Write a protein that binds this DNA or RNA. Sequence first.
DNA 1: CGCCCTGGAGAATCCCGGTGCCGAGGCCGCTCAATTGGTCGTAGACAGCTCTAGCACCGCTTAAACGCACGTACGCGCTGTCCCCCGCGTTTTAACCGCCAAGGGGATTACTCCCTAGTCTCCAGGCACGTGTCAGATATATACATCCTGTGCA
Length: 31
Amino acid sequence: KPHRYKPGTVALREIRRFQKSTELLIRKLPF
DNA sequence: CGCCCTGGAGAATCCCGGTGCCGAGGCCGCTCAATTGGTCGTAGACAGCTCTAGCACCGCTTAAACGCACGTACGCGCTGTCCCCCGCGTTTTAACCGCCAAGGGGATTACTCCCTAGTCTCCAGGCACGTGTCAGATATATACATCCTGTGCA
């Protein structure tokens, strides 16, 4: 049985992950 | 026959060491605008005096506010639908280094004249102010103009 999260679960942990990071989210060369 | 509650499972997180790494701060060399004093002349606070619109008020004169009665219709709650983007696995590209080394032009620092304007000065004139005059809005004679009344008639 594969292990899959229900839709909407990863969004919360992504909010927790990125809201704790001050790094820039855009690469240097494209900008 | 199919749904809350429980239990097993899995993985994401927290927290505590454990060692390599680098710039915060200290230390020095140095060096330049702050500090101290003197000079000088100048606007700001103190009256001084004045004058003028804000203040508090009183009383017509309407005019919005309000209370309510009806009402109807859209905000809302509920339900069924379906479709679209998240989660995940597989494909595809962007970027780093290795090779293999050279210059290049543009802001920086230093030097160097040179001439436009601050400062002072006097001469003039021009727009804020007072007054003339017409435009528009106002209030009133007026020549009829519509009921009312004597009034004479058939």
